[PDB]
Amino acid sequence: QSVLTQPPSLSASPGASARLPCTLSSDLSVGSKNMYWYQQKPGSAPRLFLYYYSDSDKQLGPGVPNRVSGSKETSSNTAFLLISGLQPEDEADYYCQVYDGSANDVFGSGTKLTVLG
Amino acid sequence: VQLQESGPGLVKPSETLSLTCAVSGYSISSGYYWGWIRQPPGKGLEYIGYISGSSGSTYYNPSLKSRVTISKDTSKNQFSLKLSSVTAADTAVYYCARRDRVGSYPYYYGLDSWGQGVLVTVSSAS
Amino acid sequence: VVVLGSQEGAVHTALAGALEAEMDGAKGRLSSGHLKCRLKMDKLRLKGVS
Amino acid sequence: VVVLGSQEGAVHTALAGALEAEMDGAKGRLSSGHLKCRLKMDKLRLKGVS
């Protein structure tokens, strides 16, 4: 097993706070998992966007601003990719990633976030 | 550390596929597992495996277990991937990326620096 | 006539505490330094004074 | 993390005065012995005295 799942499409008006979840499989405890978020513009080689493990254990991309936040809901184990200041350039495909017991890369389906207009 | 991908344009099915990756800005054999990740037409990212920089150990994917073979050569500072017995569904956009395995900063446990990427199809000739 | 076998780990323990320069890349990167330096503060100035 | 090489000759020198033995694929001949015998000569006699 050990597969991540999340919806194919999400959209929100520019300005609001967009929350991109990431539901892990049942055999994982998200509270102790280093979450890794990738951002992919349509054809430009997805870059590391945001790594989040805790509100005091976090690290963003080299140039992305503090509008991008992360959080964990350990009730139903699901990470979050929070984008507060939605600009038109936040329209991209976002992925999440964890590692199994044997440290094999486990990527997610990811959401194709679209900024409306 | 800006990786550039180079590879043939097209391979026929059931034929060996080879991609060459030049790192061009960081010396291999210092550490920093180097891997290959793909995205077939437009779907999610699927990984194949990575090779250790210093030791040279290879860790692969359970589904792509008997077909791939990743090589490394620090003389010209490159590492390659060999995909044998390709299928029609193996048409993808490949990226050789970087990753840290032993560092004390978990941000680098993810794929920090990515390559440009090559597109390869498995169709017939013309 | 017999050989003395290998001698790698025999000398591994022979340099206990000796300085180490493990890193490579065609250039030996040391893991120890005690460089004494003198700092000249003549031609440096505060940025936010004006 | 560092592995301390091989310890073959490192114990070659530490095992200096111990006895040796040449083995030949499961008979393992020895090269030492202090066997104390008591022999019976009740039936020992010269073949030629007559």
Side-chain angles (χ1 to χ4, degrees), chain A, chain B, chain C residues 1-37 39-50, chain D residues 1-21 23-37 39-50:
Chain A
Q1 205 180 5
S2 286
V3 57
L4 308 190
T5 171
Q6 248 356 266
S9 62
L10 265 200
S11 63
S13 300
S17 183
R19 303 174 60 257
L20 306 186
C22 174
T23 302
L24 283 69
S25 299
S26 61
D27 56 355
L28 299 179
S29 185
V30 79
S32 58
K33 229 59 180 177
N34 291 330
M35 304 302 309
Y36 296 98
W37 295 88
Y38 296 72
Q39 169 177 80
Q40 182 174 10
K41 286 300 190 62
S44 68
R47 46 146 170 170
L48 211 294
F49 194 53
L50 159 64
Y51 137 79
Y52 176 87
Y53 164 72
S54 177
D55 298 70
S56 300
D57 191 336
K58 60 193 298 179
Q59 187 85 296
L60 318 97
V64 310
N66 305 140
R67 312 153 22 202
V68 187
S69 244
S71 53
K72 292 184 177 183
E73 192 193 68
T74 181
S75 304
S76 64
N77 56 333
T78 290
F80 297 115
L81 178 63
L82 319 177
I83 307 180
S84 181
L86 283 179
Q87 271 199 356
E89 62 177 358
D90 299 320
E91 184 182 290
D93 314 341
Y94 297 87
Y95 296 87
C96 47
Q97 178 204 19
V98 291
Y99 303 102
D100 69 331
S102 298
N104 282 79
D105 300 17
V106 178
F107 282 105
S109 307
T111 91
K112 285 78 178 180
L113 180 61
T114 300
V115 179
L116 301 180
Chain B
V1 48
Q2 320 102 261
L3 291 80
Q4 183 92 28
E5 277 103 357
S6 183
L10 222 289
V11 302
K12 269 68 178 181
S14 303
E15 175 187 358
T16 61
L17 166 64
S18 62
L19 283 315
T20 53
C21 180
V23 19
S24 295
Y26 178 57
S27 49
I28 319 182
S29 301
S30 166
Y32 276 88
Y33 287 3
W34 315 76
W36 289 89
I37 330 286
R38 63 179 182 179
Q39 166 194 33
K43 301 184 167 56
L45 301 176
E46 184 186 16
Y47 100 100
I48 307 176
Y50 22 79
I51 184 174
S52 307
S54 60
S55 64
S57 59
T58 61
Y59 310 101
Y60 294 103
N61 182 276
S63 60
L64 313 145
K65 69 281 171 184
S66 304
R67 48 160 70 180
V68 294
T69 307
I70 295 182
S71 302
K72 174 186 56 58
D73 197 328
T74 329
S75 61
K76 55 264 183 181
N77 197 58
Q78 297 175 357
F79 67 95
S80 57
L81 168 135
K82 299 181 60 180
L83 176 50
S84 61
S85 299
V86 308
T87 329
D90 299 336
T91 165
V93 183
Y94 289 70
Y95 317 86
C96 53
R98 250 257 255 84
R99 208 267 291 283
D100 161 71
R101 72 278 204 264
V102 82
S104 302
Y105 310 139
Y107 170 84
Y108 298 92
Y109 299 163
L111 307 179
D112 48 313
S113 64
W114 283 76
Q116 162 185 338
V118 223
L119 72 169
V120 282
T121 328
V122 211
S123 60
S124 185
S126 177
Chain C
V1 38
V2 297
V3 310
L4 236 283
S6 181
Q7 216 72 19
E8 179 183 0
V11 83
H12 263 68
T13 61
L15 33 72
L19 286 315
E20 317 177 27
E22 243 102 71
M23 230 280 211
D24 215 26
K27 294 182 179 180
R29 199 152 161 176
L30 303 195
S31 63
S32 294
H34 204 258
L35 211 77
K36 173 188 174 180
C37 293
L39 294 176
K40 305 178 183 179
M41 333 297 295
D42 252 324
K43 294 303 297 178
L44 40 71
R45 40 167 292 181
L46 218 79
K47 196 64 171 299
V49 276
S50 59
Chain D
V1 12
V2 175
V3 198
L4 302 186
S6 170
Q7 226 67 15
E8 182 179 5
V11 312
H12 257 71
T13 316
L15 193 135
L19 291 318
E20 311 184 12
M23 173 163 164
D24 205 78
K27 298 292 180 65
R29 294 193 297 274
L30 239 160
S31 303
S32 184
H34 197 184
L35 196 59
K36 170 99 174 183
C37 269
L39 60 156
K40 151 176 157 291
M41 307 183 308
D42 293 331
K43 207 191 174 184
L44 223 198
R45 193 49 181 262
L46 330 96
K47 176 181 55 184
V49 80
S50 296

